[PDB]
Amino acid sequence: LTASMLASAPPQEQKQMLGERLFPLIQAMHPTLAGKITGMLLEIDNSELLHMLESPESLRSKVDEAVAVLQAHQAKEAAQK
Amino acid sequence: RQLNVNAKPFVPN
Ligand SMILES: [Zn+2]
């Protein structure tokens, strides 16, 4: 995936393009929550999403962050809701 | 660094 291929497509479809490259990696880390985490991350700068696709420590760091918030939220909706 | 927990899940293709 190149930045050129990305400008070639429109917004909505650029995330789809990026998600395809991101999914397999995020999946390896979390097979079950993969879909969701990916979805959550796709609302970030493509320029930075492009960076994460080249930096594992960065991708992982972002993934763990998403995992934490995701669980804290759900747990919240559990105690009260 | 702010994330949306209600973001629509992505699906492979
Ligand atoms: Zn919440």
Author numbering:
A (entry chain A): 545 to 625
B (entry chain B): 67 to 79
Please give me the paper's original passages concerning this structure:
Cytoplasmic poly(A)-binding protein (PABP), also termed PABPC or PABPC1, is an essential protein that binds to and mediates the stimulatory effect of the poly(A) tail on translation initiation. Previous studies showed that MLLE is a peptide-binding domain that specifically recognizes a conserved PAM2 (for PABP-interacting motif 2) sequence. Unlike other PAM2-containing proteins, eRF3 possesses two overlapping PAM2 sequences (PAM2-N and PAM2-C), which each independently bind to the MLLE domain of PABPC1 with low micromolar affinity. Here, we determined two crystal structures of the MLLE domain of human PABPC1 in complex with the PAM2-N and PAM2-C peptides from human eRF3.
We obtained well-diffracting co-crystals with eRF3 residues 67–81 (PAM2-N) and 76–90 (PAM2-C). Overlay of the MLLE/PAM2-N and MLLE/PAM2-C structures reveals striking similarity of the bound conformations despite the highly divergent peptide sequences. In both structures, the peptide binds by wrapping around the highly conserved KITGMLLE signature motif of MLLE and interacting with the hydrophobic pockets between helices α2 and α3 and between helices α3 and α5 of MLLE. At the tip of the peptide β-turn, the side chain of Val71/Val80 makes an additional hydrophobic contact with the MLLE side chains of Val613 and His617. Another hydrophobic interaction involves the invariantly conserved alanine at residue 73 of PAM2-N and at 82 of PAM2-C. At the C-terminus of both peptides, Phe76/Phe85 fits into the shallow cavity formed by Gly563, the methyl groups of Thr582 and Leu586 and the aliphatic part of Glu564. In addition to its essential side chain, the amide of Phe76/Phe85 hydrogen bonds with the carbonyl of Gly579. Thus eRF3 Phe76 plays two distinct roles in the complexes, alternately occupying the hydrophobic pocket between MLLE helices α2 and α3 in the PAM2-N complex and between helices α3 and α5 in the PAM2-C complex.
